[PDB]
Swiss-Prot record, chain A:
Chief location: cytoplasm
Designated gene of the protein: nagZ
GO CC term (a single one): cytoplasm
Family: Belongs to the glycosyl hydrolase 3 family. NagZ subfamily.
Documented EC number(s): 3.2.1.52
Pathway: Cell wall biogenesis; peptidoglycan recycling
Entry-linked InterPro entries: Beta_hexosaminidase_bac (IPR022956), Glyco_hydro_3_AS (IPR019800), Glyco_hydro_3_N (IPR001764), Glyco_hydro_3_N_sf (IPR036962), Glycoside_hydrolase_SF (IPR017853), NagZ_Beta-hexosaminidase (IPR050226)
The protein's name: Beta-hexosaminidase
């Protein structure tokens, strides 16, 4: 079982089980982790088998992630508790007050993460910290609330729940996707940095302070700060996110599928990304990995490691048998109806 | 004032008033219409001035469109009635029953179209006929309902309202954007789409829907080309099988351009949209051959607003319209 450091590329796979070609690809030093999609999911039993065999290829084990937010962003459905859209928690905040909503967000996080950890998943790419300005359809119900104070506190409560199911969090989309319109393309947020500090960046600050492991940048240009999109901007990622905010976690790149690949990757690392995502294009991963120079980043190993699931298979299966977890499942299922 | 047929390209503009360069571009025979966005809107007074000067360049007048659906897809805010997201009407259907929800959809259509016609706009790109399978975030609240029967009936009621404000409708996104994840491939069979997602498109086409926008989605069991570039979807299924006689607008071709345009026309689109990239419109239009389409002129004409300058301003003064505005405003709060 080869001992290889986790590389700075997050790739993906085609269907329900690894091909021999995928096995060889995932052994390349360039690769440190995998993102799964709905096309990789048939049922719980099959997913466990898939994650186990990904994990087995090398050490430290490849990090496995998925987009389980809730509502209309939940890759794995059959055998999982159906998760409410995050705005449902924003609505509880409005109706029953902040305390009830925090408690509810805690439960949602616990159920979401715990069911994924049972299947060998390390991390869910959640929460959305984007504010509901009432402008962006693609975000839409995925946002907790309009108010940055509610988004922050519900995001923290969700994160505590996620940690009870073994997972860290990944905030998105830095520095804020909520103000642009998004219903079709690369959109423009025309506001000043001061305006974003007052609202959209506040949850990112708060979450970073409280141990958020990772961040995904917005596919959005903010011309008052930089004409480069956030994912390709030294200003956003190094000046603002690292130095000013103090964030020590992973910065994922923008999806590099959109020079060529290699050039797109180099620009992302230069802008300050730790890891680059390359999805639905194993040909580009092949092109990228051949003769690839792993850029100098002594912080990469620890950043990957921080996202490893803290819970073992058996401890999570055991806690899923308890009355307390079953009650959490029923509660969370009820918020999704 | 040049007499030029409306070409098969729908282009756009940069800001609040036409530049001299945009005037020259919009005079090119390739262009037949304009889509406006939020960046083109400051207030009602300025919009009227903008549409008037677009209209004045040539005859027949360039068709002007906009994405006013409701909720988080509503380009023009200040001075307009704020429109509810379409799922709000789906929720009324569930709570208060189909009849209340149809009545509500009627009012929303009327207010949406009427306020846009007052500003010189011809068409809103609505309704979304995509089903709420709970899969697609980009559609999200923009969909009426999960059930194809409710989507169809609310889309019909909305369409009747739109016609009272002078507008035809444009159903989207054919053959159905609701099942894919959207935050892309729909892996289902044609039989599965006939059973649900295509039903509203059939119903709406049967009841006189004038236009359709195809999905930026590949359905590999029917064709590995996306719906917008598929002879199978647009000619075999939409024209011959369904019997649709209206406009097929392309999806946004901004992703060379000439080749992308040719494929869309060959696949069966009437008109191609090219947005946020006036450089690509320039590239496209230079030495452009307007493809053979004897139905194009009449298809454009059918989308012209049916109400005049005076007629719409007059109906906006009536008690009945004011009541409609208040009702619709209330659904959006
Ligand atoms: Zn669309
Ligand atoms: Zn985006
Ligand atoms: Zn995203
Ligand atoms: Zn789409």
């Amino acid at each position: 079982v080869p001992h290889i450091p986790r590389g700075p590329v997050m790739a993906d796979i085609a269907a329900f089980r690894l091909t021999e070609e995928e096995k060889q690809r995932l052994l390349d030093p360039a690769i440190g982790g995998i993102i799964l999609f709905r096309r990789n999911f048939q049922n719980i039993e099959q997913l466990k088998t898939l994650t186990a065999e990904i994990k087995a290829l090398r050490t430290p084990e490849l990090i496995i992630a998925v987009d389980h937010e809730g509502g209309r962003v939940q890759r794995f459905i059959e055998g999982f508790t159906r998760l409410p859209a995050m705005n449902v928690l924003g609505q509880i905040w409005d109706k029953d007050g902040a305390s009830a909503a925090e408690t509810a967000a805690g439960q949602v996080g616990r159920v979401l993460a715990t069911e994924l950890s049972a299947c060998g998943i390390d991390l869910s790419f959640t929460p959305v910290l984007d504010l509901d300005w009432g402008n962006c359809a693609v975000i839409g119900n995925r946002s907790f609330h309009r108010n940055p104070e509610a988004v922050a506190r519900l995001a923290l409560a969700l994160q505590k729940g996620l940690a009870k199911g073994g997972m860290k969090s990944c905030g998105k989309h830095f520095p804020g996707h909520g103000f642009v319109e998004g219903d079709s393309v690369l959109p423009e947020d025309g506001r000043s940095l001061d305006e974003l500090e007052a609202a959209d960046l506040a949850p990112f600050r708060i979450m970073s302070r409280e141990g958020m492991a990772a961040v995904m940048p917005a596919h959005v240009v903010y011309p008052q700060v930089d004409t480069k999109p956030a994912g390709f901007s030294e200003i956003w990622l190094k000046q603002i996110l690292r130095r000013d905010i103090g964030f020590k976690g992973v910065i994922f790149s923008d999806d590099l599928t959109m020079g060529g690949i290699k050039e797109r990757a180099r620009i992302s690392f230069e802008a300050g990304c730790d890891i680059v995502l390359v999805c639905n294009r194993p040909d580009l991963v092949d092109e990228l990995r051949d003769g690839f120079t792993i850029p100098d980043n002594q912080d990469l190993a620890g950043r990957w490691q921080y996202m490893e699931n803290s819970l073992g298979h058996e401890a999570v299966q055991a806690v899923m048998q308890t009355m307390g977890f079953q009650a959490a499942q029923a509660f969370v299922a009820g918020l999704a109806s």
